[PDB]
Amino acid sequence: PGIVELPSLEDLKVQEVKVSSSVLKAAAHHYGAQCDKPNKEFMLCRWEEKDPRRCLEEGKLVNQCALEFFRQIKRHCAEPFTEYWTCIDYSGLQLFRRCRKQQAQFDECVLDKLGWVRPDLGDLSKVTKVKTDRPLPENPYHSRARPEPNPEVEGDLKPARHGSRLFFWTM
Amino acid sequence: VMKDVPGWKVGESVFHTTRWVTPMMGELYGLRASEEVLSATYGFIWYT
Amino acid sequence: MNPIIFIIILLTIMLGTIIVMISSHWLLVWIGFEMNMLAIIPIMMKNHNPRATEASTKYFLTQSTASMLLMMAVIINLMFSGQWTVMKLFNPMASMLMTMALAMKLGMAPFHFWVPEVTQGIPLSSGLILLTWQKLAPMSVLYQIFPSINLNLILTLSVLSILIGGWGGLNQTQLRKIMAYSSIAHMGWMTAVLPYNPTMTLLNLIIYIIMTSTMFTMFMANSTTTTLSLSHTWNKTPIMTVLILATLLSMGGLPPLSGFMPKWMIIQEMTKNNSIILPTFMAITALLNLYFYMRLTYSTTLTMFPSTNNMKMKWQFPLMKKMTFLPTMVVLSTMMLPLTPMLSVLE
Amino acid sequence: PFFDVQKRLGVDLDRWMTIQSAEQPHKIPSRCHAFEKEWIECAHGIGSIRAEKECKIEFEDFRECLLRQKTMKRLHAIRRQREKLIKEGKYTPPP
Amino acid sequence: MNLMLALLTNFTLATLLVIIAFWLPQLNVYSARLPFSMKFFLVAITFLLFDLEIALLLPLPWASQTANLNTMLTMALFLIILLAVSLAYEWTQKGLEWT
Amino acid sequence: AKTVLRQYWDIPEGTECHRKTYATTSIGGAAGLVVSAYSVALKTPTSFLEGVARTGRYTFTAAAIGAIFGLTSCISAQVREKPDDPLNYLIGGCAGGLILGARTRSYGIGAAACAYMGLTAALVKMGQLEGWQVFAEPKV
Amino acid sequence: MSMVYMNIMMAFTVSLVGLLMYRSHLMSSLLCLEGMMLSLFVMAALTILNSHFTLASMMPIILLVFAACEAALGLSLLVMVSNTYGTDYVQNLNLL
Amino acid sequence: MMLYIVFILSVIFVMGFVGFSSKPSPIYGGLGLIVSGGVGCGIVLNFGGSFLGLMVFLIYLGGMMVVFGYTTAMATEQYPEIWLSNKAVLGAFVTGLLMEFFMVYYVLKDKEVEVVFEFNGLGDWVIYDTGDSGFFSEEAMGIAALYSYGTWLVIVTGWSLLIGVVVIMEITRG
Amino acid sequence: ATFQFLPDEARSLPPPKLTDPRLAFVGFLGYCSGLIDNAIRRRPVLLAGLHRQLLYITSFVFVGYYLLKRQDYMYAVRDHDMFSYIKSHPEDFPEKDKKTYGEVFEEFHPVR
Amino acid sequence: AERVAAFLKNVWAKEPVLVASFAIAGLAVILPTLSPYTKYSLMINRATPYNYPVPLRDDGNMPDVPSHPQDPQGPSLEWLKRL
Ligand SMILES: CCCCCCCCCCCCCCCCCC(=O)OC[C@H](COP(=O)(O)OCCN)OC(=O)CCCCCCCCCCCCCCCCC
Ligand SMILES: CCCCCCCCCCCCO[C@@H]1O[C@H](CO)[C@@H](O[C@H]2O[C@H](CO)[C@@H](O)[C@H](O)[C@H]2O)[C@H](O)[C@H]1O
Ligand SMILES: CCCCCCCCCCCCO[C@@H]1O[C@H](CO)[C@@H](O[C@H]2O[C@H](CO)[C@@H](O)[C@H](O)[C@H]2O)[C@H](O)[C@H]1O
Ligand SMILES: CCCCCCCCCCCCO[C@@H]1O[C@H](CO)[C@@H](O[C@H]2O[C@H](CO)[C@@H](O)[C@H](O)[C@H]2O)[C@H](O)[C@H]1O
Ligand SMILES: N=C(N)NC(=N)NCCc1ccc(I)c(Cl)c1
Structure with missing residues (x-):
């Protein structure tokens, strides 16, 4: 067996999205609409390549889009967004249904100042299609050549030559 | 640690295939403090 | 029930x-x-x-x-x-x-x-x-x-079953224990050939079942569970003694009877694999079974044991048991050797 | 099966649970899915006599994923060397 | 962790109360067959068999999330109906009488 | 068994008599212990010591039979200068049969054992020379 | 193999040895039989859970249901034996 | 150390088996199987098998073993023998514990052992899965599938349980 | 095929003749079962229930005929398999060079 | 019918618990096939997204697959929101 090739620690550095899950939860619906393209490109790479080392550049673009997404909230909608995810953060299950009044304020804000429309029920679970210039991998499983099948037996079935040929039998 | 062990190859796979293999718990945390290993292994199961 | x-x-x-x-x-x-x-x-x-x-x-x-x-x-x-x-x-x-x-x-x-x-x-x-x-x-x-x-392991199990089954039957006067030991020996033949040709396992199994069902059916028709009870058969249903004689000779592997077929074919498969000692030993050990099968034929069909007076009362009544499939089973138990090449249907 | 009624009638009585690369609820994969799939595809249709020889690479990898005997050995080995140097004082763990 | 502590505390406290309940000052200075019906064995065995099938019904709340509702509903009712047949058999064979 | 049996056959005939006698005595003793185990398990001894006595009787008898066979057969090959000769095992097989007659205090068992063990031992030597298979691997 | 399999396998062997080495009560042997099922349940569950073979998650439940049903039958024979002799001692079962 | 919970539980599992397998009074034999059942559930729970662990408590301990003890009181023993009074029980019990202690001592010492077969001693946590972030219990999904994939399992299982009622009623009628 | 008594390819083979000596023997076995049926139940062996004797012969022949078809088919398949393997592996079945007896040396063993 | 009505009245008088059990069990078997809402049960269960919806590699011949989640193509849950 060979050597497992690993990227260097310097290849793995990227600005991190260091916000808590209640913050991601609060912005998730608008994040799904805004950052769909780099997100869906990266997920296509992962299910096609089946190898984390082969999708690191797409992974960094995922972070870069999320950081620009959250900077846009910070520039125009910081106060309505903080009121909303704090409301989410209070719940032990982080429930949307307990925060509709604060969600509406955060939603009226991004729609007005950023043009963001919250995707409708069922939208973010759609299967989509992405145009990637990354070539389709040929042998993602790294399969060896398969063993050759046994020769196919063919022809016309004829009666057994002189029958069963069991000891003395003539049939 | 294995610089002087004779015949050792660093980072050698145990699999014939060169396909990426998901590492198990020991591979990731095999050299780390027991506390992080407790959390990684039994934290979810032991969380109320 | x-x-x-x-x-x-x-x-x-x-x-x-x-x-x-x-x-x-x-x-x-x-x-x-x-x-x-x-x-x-x-x-x-x-x-x-x-x-x-x-x-x-x-x-x-x-x-x-x-x-x-x-x-x-x-x-x-x-x-x-x-x-x-x-x-x-x-x-x-x-x-x-x-x-x-x-x-x-x-x-x-x-x-x-x-x-x-x-x-x-x-x-x-x-x-x-x-x-x-x-x-x-x-x-x-x-x-x-x-x-x-x-x-x-499989051949050791097969060899022991042939030995134990043969010796175990020698000491028996109960028909059910005779069948039990007869069964143990026959399983040894079935598994002995399994590593070589499973088809001959199936052939032995089917014929053993046919012969075994015939004996049990005939024991049931008369309510005989012991050798001595079975020795009264000649003075009630003479035909049953003849049928029991033929089936017993067949379960002993005597040609030209059906029960010779599985042992004949198993010996062939083993020898094709250069196994001479084992089939020879099995065939000779199977003579133990033939001895206590023959003993039943002596007390049931080839001699006439003493009867009792109350037996006369039985002469007046017919057999009412179903004896389902018995005429077919007894014929298949004894007369199938000319059709031995039919074993290929099991392939 | 001794009698292959299932294939004759085109009914799936119990094939669905035979292997771990078969269809799972919500497409949940088994840990060794890729390894089972590789071995099965290698050995398909050629017979176990050929398979035990010609699909031996795929099967050893599958057994390594199943039981992780080489991996546990390699880790157990690196750990001894570590504890030796720590005790002998020629190694110091990073922070 | 929290569950193991809660369990330890419950039975530790029960142990302490019991041993204390047994030790206090006082101030004192000076393998057969029970004559018990076959009917009670059958109640226990019947409970066991019914309990085993309730084990098979317990997953039903999760099974109702399936897209294969035709099959799920048929199998769920099939099981409960066979459970009812078992009771009807006990019942009509006088397995539930005490006389 | 494989380990002990392979040791016996590895040693050439008529050389290292003591090494041959260890292999047969070990093989014989193991057989006697096997018989004792079943005898004690199926026919219960009256007392613990009686069970120990029975194991010693069977285990010593089997070891003695194996010991004399290995000694007798290997000396005969050495004395006669006939290594690959079945007759050496015929002599060894009969000697072991006589010891059984002695241990069981019977002349009939000794006479029968000589004939039955002697032929069996000689056939084992022909099988070794001729390559006869007892448990033959499936070939066809 | 992992540590656990040693002890679970050891547990199965202990109960099997217990099963094969009767004492007197038939109930004790029935307990060794159910001990074997328990160790089979644990070993099956561990193998199935650790490999994340999802559909086999049901297999251990099936094993428990059938073994319990087999245990109910064994208990029924025990009581029928005890009704005949007044004890469940296996040395009474020597008519055959 | 808590990282060895499954190993420690498996040791208690085995010692409980040496307990009831040495065959004290079936009253105490039943207790040892009950403790093993609980410990056996503990092992399963630490592999993510919450449902399967609980079925051991519900069906094995709460169902089958309750009936075992019930039958023991009716037809086996009402008065238990003093524990380990018999020499065979004491010898086997001590003999079994002695093997378990030696098995444990060497695994802990060397972090491996060869008891007939080779076993590792790093710790059971090493082989665990490292990735997990589905919103469901996989075990539960697999068990729920008994009603979608397992039609044939349900039919034969349900038939067998009905026949169990029929058979046991015949058996005990006399 | 799979779990099929007489697959479709078997229809390429000639059927057994209804005058097949093996099928005649099967019918005789069916006749013998009919006689044994009369004997065990103590009926007149030859005359009793000719309707029942007829169904014995018919059932044996009907089942025997189909068993003989599968029998002959299974030997045809064996031969087809054997010859295909020999054609696929000519290196294992060389056409050996045959000497005449004038060329081959055989030792003479006098019987005196 | 008249004989069946008499039989049902007799068991109503004598075994009302059993009559109720059989009526309820009969409705459990029968009403799911007659109910207009039973079809939404499958649709709702189908619509619940338990795992990630992996995207497709756009090849230029997929006019029915959306490029964005807020595009009009693809399945809609409008029936579910109204329902
Ligand atoms: C064809 C290929 C296969 C070839 C293999 C050979 C197959 C032969 C076996 C066929 C299957 C068994 C059927 C045997 C038929 C037996 C017929 C018979 O023996 O006669 C019956 C006779 C009836 O007696 P009863 O009830 O009293 O009525 C007449 C009034 N006395 O009964 C009696 O009277 C009883 C008389 C006492 C018994 C005398 C014992 C000697 C007779 C032995 C003949 C049977 C030989 C069978 C053994 C196999 C032969 C090779
Ligand atoms: C009567 C009591 C019964 C108690 C049963 C208790 C269950 C015991 C289960 C033990 C399973 C271990 O099974 C055993 O494991 C080792 C681990 O590699 C395997 O492997 C071993 O032999 C093979 C040989 O090719 C190689 O992998 C290697 O030489 C060696 O590691 C064995 O081939 C296997 O037989
Ligand atoms: C004791 C009496 C015995 C009577 C036996 C009666 C017949 C029993 C047949 C049960 C199996 C029926 O046939 C089988 O069942 C279910 C539907 O029901 C189907 O299986 C279904 O569930 C899962 C869900 O994905 C998958 O296996 C499959 O995709 C789906 O179609 C099988 O594709 C079908 O082949
Ligand atoms: C001892 C044997 C006992 C056997 C008991 C069997 C009882 C079975 C009773 C209910 C079986 C059918 O139950 C129900 O029937 C209706 C028929 O409209 C089906 O139909 C419903 O769901 C389907 C899904 O394909 C929709 O497309 C359809 O529009 C809707 O009406 C349900 O999917 C099915 O769940
Ligand atoms: N000889 C084995 N051990 N097995 C086996 N049956 N091999 C197949 C050889 C064979 C023999 C007869 C027929 I008819 C057919 Cl079709 C094929």
Whole structure:
């Protein structure tokens, strides 16, 4: 067996999205609409390549889009967004249904100042299609050549030559 | 640690295939403090 | 027992066996054995007496133990191959455990002790199921796992069953114990050829079942469970003595009778594989069976034992037992040798 | 199966649970899915006599994923060397 | 962790109360068959068999999330109906009488 | 068994008599222990010591039979200068048969054992020379 | 193999040895039989859970259901034996 | 150390088996199987098998073993023998514990052992899965599938349980 | 095929003749079963229930005929398999060079 | 019918618990096939997204697959929101 090739620690550095899950939860619906393209490109790479080392550049673009997404909230909608995810953060299950009044304020804000429309029920679970210039991998499983099948037996079935040929039998 | 062990190859796979293999718990945390290993292994199961 | 319940229980005995034979999953095989054992215990107990309870308990303990060993082998197989497909096993300890588990179910020596005990303690009709139908499911599993069975274990089990079955029958006056030991020896022939040609395992099994069903059916028609009771047959139904004579000569492997066929064909397959000593030893040991089969023919058909006066009362009444399929079975038990090439249908 | 009623009738009585690369609820994969799939595809249709020889690479990898005996050995080995140097004082763990 | 502590505390407290309940000052200076019916064995065995099938019904709340509702509903009712047949058999064979 | 049996056959005939006698005595003693185990398990001894006595009787008898066979057969090959000769095992097989007659205090068992053990031992030597298979591997 | 399999396998062997080495009570042997099922249940569950073979998650439940049903039958034979002799001692079961 | 919970539980599992397998009074034999059942559930729970662990408590302990003890009181023993009074029970019990202690001592010492077969001693946590972030219990999904994928399992299982009622009623009627 | 008594390819083979000596022997076995049926139940062996004797012969022949078809089919398949393997593996079945007896040396063993 | 009505009245008088059990069990078997809402049960269960919806590699021949989650193509849950 060979050597497992690993990227260097310097290849793995990227600005991190260091916000808590209640913050991601609060912005998730608008994040799904805004950052769909780099997100869906990266997920296509992962299910096609089946190898984390082969999708690191797409992974960094995922972070870069999320950081620009959250900077846009910070520039125009910081106060309505903080009121909303704090409301989410209070719940032990982080429930949307307990925060509709604060969600509406955060939603009226991004729609007005950023043009963001919250995707409708069922939208973010759609299967989509992405145009990637990354070539389709040929042998993602790294399969060896398969063993050759046994020769196919063919022809016309004829009666057994002189029958069963069991000891003395003539049939 | 294995610089002087004779015949050792660093980072050698145990699999014939060169396909990426998901590492198990020991591979990731095999050299780390027991506390992080407790959390990684039994934290979810032991969380109320 | 209500006749409808008896029918449903019998169909459950058959269903569990059929589940074993059609299953591709080890779990369903194990379920089939579990279903089958549950439904057979009540037909062992149906006469409700201490001897039937003892037989049922001994049978339950043996079969339950073998079911646990079988499931242990299956789980070991899962650990080392990650799959449940019924086929060759992927671990030698799994293969040994399953082989011993299946040997116990069949009652092969040295796991044989329960077969004479249990058969004696249950009615003839229940003994007919135990020594015929109950062989199908374990044999059908051996038919599929044989490539991974250890040759020395299987041949050692086969050789012991032929020896124990032969010697065990010499000392018997009870017909059920004679059948039990006769069964143990025949299983040894069946498994001895299995590593070489499973088709000859199936041929031996089918013919053994036919001959075994014939004997049990004839014992039932007269209510004979002992040699001496059977020796009164000449003075009631003379035809039955002739039929019992022919079937006994056939179960002894005498040409030109049907029971010669499985031993003839097994000897051939073994020799084709350069196995001379083993088939020779098996054939000679099988002469032990012929001795105590012949002894029954002497006391039943070829001589006339003393009778009793009350026997005259029996002359006035006909046989009312069903003796279902007996005329067909006895003809197949004795006259099939000219059709030996028909074995290819088992291929 | 002894009698292959299932294939004759086109009914799936128990094939669905036989292997771990078969269809699972919500497409949940088994840990060794890729390894089982590789071995099965290699050995398909050629017979177990050929398979035990010609698909031996795929099967050893599958057994390594199933039980992790080489991996546990390699880790257990690196750990001894570590404890030796720590005790002998020629190694110091990073922070 | 929290569950193991809660369990330890419950039975530790029960142990302490019991042993204390047994030790206090006082101030004192000076293998057969029970004659018990076969009927009670059958109640226990009947409970066991019914309990085993309730084990098979317990997953039903999860099974109703399936897209294969035709099959799920049929199998769920099949099981409960067979459970009812078992009771009807006990009942009509006088397995539930105490006289 | 494989380990001990392979040791016996590895040693050439008529050389290292003591090494041959250890292999047969070990093989014989193991057989006697096997018989004792089943005898004690199936026919229960009256007392613990009686069980120990029975194991010693069977285990010593089997070892003695194996010891004399290995000694007798290997000396004969050495004395006669006939290594690959079945007759050496015929002599060894009969000597072992006589000891059984002695241990069981019977002349009939000794006469029968001589004939039955002698032929069996001689056939084992022909099988070794001729390559006869007892448990033959499936070939066809 | 992992540590656990040693002890679970050891537990199964202990109960099997207990099963094969009867004392007097038939109930004690029935307990060894159910001990074997328990160790089979644990070993099956561990193998199935650790490999994340999802559909087999049901297998151990099936095993428990059938083994319990087998245990109910074994108990029924025990009481029928005890009704005949007044004890469940296996040395009474020697008529055959 | 808590990282060895499964190993420690498996040791208690085995010692409980040496307990009931040495065959004290079936009253105490039943207790040892009950403790093993609880410990056996503990092992399963630490592999993510919450449902399967609880079924051991519900069906094995709460169902089957309750009936075992019930039958023991009726037809086996009402008065238990003093524990380990018999020499065979004491010898086997001590013999079994002695093997378990030696098995444990060497595994802990060397972090491996060869008891007939080779076993590792790093710790059971090493082989655990590292990735997990589905919103469901996989075990529960697999068990729920008994009603969608397992039609055939349900039919044979349900039939067998009905036959169990029929069979046991025949058996005990006398 | 799979779990099929007489697959479709078997229809390429000639059927057994209804005058097949093996089928005649099967019918005789069916006749013998009819006589044994009369004997065990103590009926007149030759005359009793000719309707029942007829169904014995018919059932044996009907089942025997189909068993003989599968028998002959299974030997045809064996031969088809054998010859295909020999054609696929000509290196294992060389056409050996055959000497005449004038060329081959055989030792003489006098019988005196 | 008249004979059946008399039989039902007799068991209503004598075994009202059993009559209720059989009526309820009959409705459990029968009403799912007659109910207009039973079809939404499958649709709702189908619509619940338990795992990630892996995207497709756009090849230029997929006019029915959306490029964005807020595009009009693809399945809609409008029936569910109204329902
Ligand atoms: C064809 C290829 C296959 C070839 C293999 C050979 C097959 C032969 C076996 C066929 C299957 C068994 C059927 C045998 C038929 C027996 C017929 C018979 O013996 O006669 C019956 C006779 C009836 O007696 P009863 O009831 O009293 O009525 C008459 C009034 N006395 O009964 C009696 O009277 C009883 C008289 C006492 C018994 C005398 C014993 C000697 C007779 C032995 C003949 C049977 C030989 C069978 C052994 C196999 C032969 C090779
Ligand atoms: C009667 C009591 C029954 C108690 C049963 C208890 C269950 C015991 C299960 C043990 C399973 C271990 O099974 C055993 O494991 C080792 C681990 O590699 C396997 O492997 C071993 O042999 C093979 C040989 O090719 C190689 O992998 C290697 O030489 C060696 O490691 C064995 O082939 C297998 O037989
Ligand atoms: C004791 C009496 C015995 C009577 C036996 C009666 C017949 C039993 C047949 C049960 C199996 C029926 O047939 C089988 O079942 C279910 C539907 O029901 C189907 O299986 C269904 O569930 C899962 C869900 O994905 C998948 O296996 C499959 O995709 C789906 O179609 C199988 O594709 C079908 O082949
Ligand atoms: C001892 C044997 C006992 C057997 C008991 C069997 C009882 C079975 C009763 C209910 C079986 C059918 O139950 C129900 O029937 C209706 C028929 O409209 C089906 O139909 C419903 O769901 C389907 C899904 O394909 C929709 O497309 C359809 O529009 C809707 O009406 C349900 O999918 C099915 O769940
Ligand atoms: N000889 C084995 N051990 N097995 C086996 N039956 N191999 C197949 C050889 C064979 C023999 C007869 C026929 I008819 C057919 Cl079709 C094929």
